[PDB]
Amino acid sequence: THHVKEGHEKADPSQFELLKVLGQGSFGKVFLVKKISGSDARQLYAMKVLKKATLKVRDRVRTKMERDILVEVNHPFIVKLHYAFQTEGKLYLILDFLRGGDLFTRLSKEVMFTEEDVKFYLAELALALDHLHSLGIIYRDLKPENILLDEEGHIKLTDFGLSKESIDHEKKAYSFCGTVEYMAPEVVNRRGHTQSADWWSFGVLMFEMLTGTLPFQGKDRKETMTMILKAKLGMPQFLSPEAQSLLRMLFKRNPANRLGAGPDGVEEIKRHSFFSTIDWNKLYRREIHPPFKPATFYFDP
Numbered sequence: 001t002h003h004v005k006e007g008h009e010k011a012d013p014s015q016f017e018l019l020k021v022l023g024q025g026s027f028g029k030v031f032l033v034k035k036i037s038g039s040d041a042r043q044l045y046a047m048k049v050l051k052k053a054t055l056k057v058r059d060r061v062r063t064k065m066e067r068d069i070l071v072e073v074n075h076p077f078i079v080k081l082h083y084a085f086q087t088e089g090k091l092y093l094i095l096d097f098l099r100g101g102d103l104f105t106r107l108s109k110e111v112m113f114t115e116e117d118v119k120f121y122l123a124e125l126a127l128a129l130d131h132l133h134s135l136g137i138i139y140r141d142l143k144p145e146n147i148l149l150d151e152e153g154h155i156k157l158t159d160f161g162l163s164k165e166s167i168d169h170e171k172k173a174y175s176f177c178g179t180v181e182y183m184a185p186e187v188v189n190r191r192g193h194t195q196s197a198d199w200w201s202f203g204v205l206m207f208e209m210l211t212g213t214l215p216f217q218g219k220d221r222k223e224t225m226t227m228i229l230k231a232k233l234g235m236p237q238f239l240s241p242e243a244q245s246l247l248r249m250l251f252k253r254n255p256a257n258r259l260g261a262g263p264d265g266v267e268e269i270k271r272h273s274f275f276s277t278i279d280w281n282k283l284y285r286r287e288i289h290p291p292f293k294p295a296t297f298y299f300d301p
């Protein structure tokens with residue numbers, strides 16, 4: 001072997017100026033940062049910092065998986081990872097900075113969305129999910145908090161729910177993660193989180209955005225789970241027949257019979273009547289205008 005070293009200009013946390021704390025949680029802390037040095041100097045990013053001491057084995061395994069998945073993904077509707085580095089006591093992920101907020105913050109203000117907006121948000125999401133499926137990846141927590149918006153108003157699916165289907169299948173017996181209300185019957189019964197389970201959560205999110213409420217929810221965790229399994233849902237009648245049809249096809253308890261599980265795959269969702277006004281090629285090319293868009297006294301002659 002050749003005992004010669006490769007020269008490189010490595011990144012470290014001191015190349016990123018701290019602007020403000022965007023959020024905090026069990027995962028760690030998120031900051032808005034400004035790159036100081038390099039070709040991307042002055043560029044803004046979201047910096048997620050995880051303390052190695054406030055980190056379980058499962059937490060360390062999970063972070064490594066998210067980083068590896070993000071390095072493998074390039075899609076217009078999924079968050080991009082720009083950097084990953086570590087210190088003796090901390091782990092850093094440098095991701096896209098998204099100024100448009102999240103779908104949950106927006107849902108809480110509006111109470112409910114129009115079919116026009118739900119059709120736009122779900123169509124971009126369907127593309128993001130199918131791209132993940134093409135790489136053997138599933139989304140274990142498809143809640144509206146995990147979908148951010150950019151300056152234009154296009155969606156960006158976060159990394160927080162990213163899991164590999166092969167890894168998830170081997171751990172399913174000793175692993176119970178995610179938000180209960182969004183779980184497919186087979187996930188509640190620990191039979192495994194398949195691509196079909198992503199299309200059930202996709203319908204839960206659809207129902208919540210259109211009606212302002214979750215379709216299967218009880219007085220506690222236990223009741224919600226039994227409700228997901230019995231699955232006897234009343235369809236709000238202010239919903240269009242197209243929205244109602246899509247919801248019933250997605251809320252099929254047998255994962256094999258659920259819309260998207262068939263031979264055509266995502267084409268079963270794409271060709272549904274609810275999405276007939278969507279040009280899927282133009283949408284992917286970000287050529288479709290978002291129906292919603294996120295974010296002096298003196299006068300003289």
Ligand SMILES: CN1CCN(c2ccc(-c3ccncc3-c3cc(F)c(O)c(F)c3)cc2)CC1
Nearest residue numbers: 022023024025030046048079096097098158159
């Ligand atoms: C409990 N909350 C705490 C705050 N949290 C939260 C989520 C997103 C953000 C956030 C805000 C703005 N831009 C990017 C991110 C971001 C995106 C990702 F894909 C991440 O992986 C990440 F780390 C940060 C800011 C806070 C959501 C969950």
